[PDB]
């Protein structure tokens, strides 16, 4: 049908923005874990070398 004239375009751009979000959020959660695992490490190291 004619309304299918947008079926292959609106969904195509939605998939484009989906892969966008995949790039900008699968990397963002890496910013979440990277900024967190590297932040809980310093105090643990401090206590590790402060028992001695």
């Amino acid at each position: 049908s004619q309304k299918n004239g947008i079926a292959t375009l609106l969904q195509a751009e939605k998939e484009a923005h989906e892969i966008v979000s995949k790039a900008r959020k699968y990397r963002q959660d890496k910013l979440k874990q990277a900024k967190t695992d590297a932040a809980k490490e310093i105090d643990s190291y401090k206590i590790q070398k402060d028992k001695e």
Binding site: Q2, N4, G5, I6, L9
Partner: peptide, 18 residues
């Protein structure tokens, strides 16, 4: 009627086939 991301225009019938 469908089927930046697309091109629109209008031409004379003399060259529609070519």
């Amino acid at each position: 009627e469908f089927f930046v991301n697309y091109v629109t225009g209008v031409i004379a019938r003399d060259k529609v086939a070519t």
